[model samples]
Target: SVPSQKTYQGSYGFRLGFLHSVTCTYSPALNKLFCQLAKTCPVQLWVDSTPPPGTRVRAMAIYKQSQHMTEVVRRCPHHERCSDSDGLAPPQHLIRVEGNLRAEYLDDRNTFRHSVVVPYEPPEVGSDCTTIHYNYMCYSSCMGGMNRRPILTIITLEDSSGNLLGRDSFEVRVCACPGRDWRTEEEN
Candidate 1:
C-alpha cells in the first residue's frame, strides 16, 4: 500500500486469506509507492490465515465503490477478462521470480501468500482492460472517464467459496503520464 491512507470497507470470514501490504522492489531494486502507466508495479502480499489451514484460497482484486464492491473468482487473463480493479495486485517484500499469475500456496509456519501485479495503463480510451505483469486488468472506469486521475484502492483475498479474508489498499498512482509521460509512475 505504500502505506495508503485509503482503507478497506468490507471484511469477512476467518475462512479466507488475510492480505497485508508491504514495500517491495522489482523486476530488481526497491520502489517507493509508485506505478508507471508504461510499466507496472509488483505488490508484496503477506496474508495471515484464519481458514481451517487446509482450505483452498486465492486472492483477487475487485471493484471498489461508494459503499460496496464486487468479487472475481478467476484470473482474468489480460486478454478478454479480468479487471485491474484489485485497484492493483502484488507479491511479497523481497524480489522473487516474477510469476505469470499470482497464485496462492500453503505456508507451513502459519500463513498463505500470493504475489499480484498492479499495471499502470488504466482503461484505455474505452476499454477498462490492459495487459501487463500477471494481469489482464480493465478499469470499471472502462464502464464509466478521459478525466485521468490517480486511483487509490484496496484489494482483497478470499476463500474458494467466496469468503473475504485479508484486505489491502495502497498509495500508488496509475498514470500514463502527467499528461502523457513517466517514473515513480505512481503515488502522486
Candidate 2:
C-alpha cells in the first residue's frame, strides 16, 4: 500500500536507510524552532536516555508528545480520508524526536547549540510484502500554517549539561515524493 497525503492508498513508507542530522538554535522569542540540516526526517527519531551525568529531564512526555505531534502533522493533509470533518491541522510548539539521542532534556533555562544524529533506515525485512512496493518520501514539519512570519533566532543541540556536540553529520535524501503516482498510468 502506498501512503499519500492527498489521495487513496495513503500509507507511509518504511523508514529504511535514512540518517538523521539535526542542527538548530533555540531562542526565547521565536516560536517555530528548527534544526540546521539539509532535510527533516519523516519518522521522528530521538534518544530517550543518554542524558548528562546529573540532570533532571522530562523524557517520557517530551518524547511521546513529539511523536504524537509528528503523526498529527503527517496526517493533516489526508483530508479526503475524513469526508465529514474539516481538515485542519492541530497547533503545536514542540515536535521533538522520539527517545533521546543525547543528554536528558533538562527543564533548565538554557539554550543549546549542538547537533543530533539519528538513524532512519529500518531493519532489513526477511520476506518481501509483494503488495507494498517501496517508494520515496513526502514530509513537512510545519503544518497548520504556523510560523507564517519569519524571525531571527538560533536553537542549537547540546547535551543536558550544555555541552556542544559539534555538528550532526547525518545526511537526508532528497526524494521526489514518497510513494508513486499511479492514477496517471493506471488502466481505466
Identify the candidate with maximal TM-score: 1
lDDT of 2 at 124: 39
**Model 1 misplaced stretches (Cα beyond 4 Å):** 1-32, 48-98, 101-146, 176-188
What does candidate 1's lDDT look like per residue over 113-186, in tens digits? 22332212222476423322322233222222212232333454444454454455542333333222222333
After superposition, the stretches of candidate 2 with alpha carbons farther than 4 Å from their true spots are 1-91, 99-157, 169-177, 180-188
Provide the lDDT at 13 for model 1. 25
Give lDDT: candidate 1, residue 22: 16
Against the true structure, candidate 1 has what lDDT? 0.30
TM-scores of the models, in the order given = 0.35, 0.23
| Residue 67 local lDDT, model 1 | 27
- Give lDDT: candidate 2, residue 11: 22
* Cα lDDT, all candidates: 0.30, 0.23
> In terms of lDDT, which candidate is strongest?
1
